[PDB]
């Protein structure tokens, strides 16, 4: 479950810190599979690589029921007719 | 006084049956049989030794038994009692051979073979 507090990658954090000191940036190329929701990612945007192409998704103010690891299933159409 | 000895080995249960003079009764691990062996009103079989062997003079029993289930332990008492009756005097050896319960039953749980499952059931057949 949860260990070492919130789990990060310690290098995407460097990029977000560098781009957050000035006016916030709405473009961030990343992988975002070893990161969790925490208040320092508010107001930014992330392009999570689901496996074919990373797609930007903007951070909202209500990140309690969502995680930035995945925004859409890597199974496109979820392997079903409907 | 004199004390005879017998043993019962069946269903991986060994009872070190020791026979002593007295009214005729048992002490399984220095305890009574009724509550030690759960739902064991079957002591009729356990006292069948007294009803069919050596007239009906009951002989006190002291038993130290470990291993196997409670029913297997109970039947293991019978073998030790029968052995003690045998070694008391050979007169009833033939009668015990003719009264049953003397030939030790080698029937214990056997091995598990591949193909069985949680229920010991062979695999099914390719139906439909």
């Amino acid at each position: 479950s949860i260990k070492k507090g919130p789990f990060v990658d310690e290098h995407l954090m460097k990029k977000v810190e560098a781009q957050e000191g000035s006016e916030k940036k709405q473009v961030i190329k990343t992988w975002s599979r070893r990161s969790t929701i925490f208040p320092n990612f508010i107001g930014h945007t992330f392009a999570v690589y689901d496996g074919r192409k990373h797609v930007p998704v903007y951070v909202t103010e209500d990140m309690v029921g969502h995680k930035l690891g995945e925004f859409a299933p890597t199974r496109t159409f979820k392997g079903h007719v409907a | 006084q004199v004390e005879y000895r017998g043993t019962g080995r069946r269903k991986n249960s060994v009872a070190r049956v020791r026979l002593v003079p007295g009214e005729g009764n048992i002490t399984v691990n220095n305890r009574d049989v009724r509550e030690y062996l759960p739902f064991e009103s079957l002591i009729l079989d356990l006292n069948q030794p007294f009803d069919v062997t050596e007239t009906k003079g009951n002989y006190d029993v002291l038993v130290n038994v470990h291993g196997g289930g409670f029913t297997g332990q109970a039947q293991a008492i019978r073998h030790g009692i029968a052995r003690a009756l045998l070694e008391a005097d050979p007169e009833y050896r033939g009668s015990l051979k003719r009264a049953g319960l003397l030939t030790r039953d080698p029937r214990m749980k056997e091995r598990k073979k591949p193909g069985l499952k949680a229920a010991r059931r062979s695999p099914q057949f390719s139906k439909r």
Binding site: - | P38, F39, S41, L42, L44, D45
Partner: protein, 140 residues
């Protein structure tokens, strides 16, 4: 061919109780089955107070069938051991199918009613009689 029968019984008076404790021993558990059949013993000795031996003997002497069947159907003479076994199996089947409230009210009602030579036990008895007598056309 061998049967591996068991002689002794906690209640020595009747040896059919061995078959009883064996068949009611479902799901690999013996203690509670023996407990509930003792409860049936007690209640049948209590309701219409009499020794359970007589009522049980009436049940095991009136519900015994003489007509069975072994794409052709033929009546066949029944061996006494198979007849008693089938009777006891039907008794436990009635116990299961009745599905009454208490542990043993169904069992005691079954044995008492079979002793009365009435009820679903004799209904199944006459079903066996008439179903087998319908098959007599293949006897010749």
């Amino acid at each position: 061919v061998p049967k591996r029968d068991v002689l002794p019984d906690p209640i020595h008076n009747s040896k059919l109780v061995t078959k009883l404790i064996n068949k009611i021993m479902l799901d690999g558990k013996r203690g509670t089955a023996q407990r509930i059949l003792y409860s049936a013993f007690d209640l049948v000795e209590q309701r219409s107070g009499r020794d359970a031996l007589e009522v049980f003997e009436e049940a095991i002497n009136n519900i015994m069938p003489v007509l069975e069947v072994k794409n052709y159907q033929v009546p066949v003479e029944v061996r006494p051991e198979r007849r008693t076994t089938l009777g006891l199996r039907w008794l436990v089947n009635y116990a299961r199918l009745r599905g009454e409230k208490t542990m043993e009210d169904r069992l005691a009602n079954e044995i008492l009613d079979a002793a009365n030579n009435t009820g679903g036990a004799v209904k199944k008895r006459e079903d066996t009689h008439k179903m087998a007598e319908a098959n007599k056309a293949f006897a010749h």
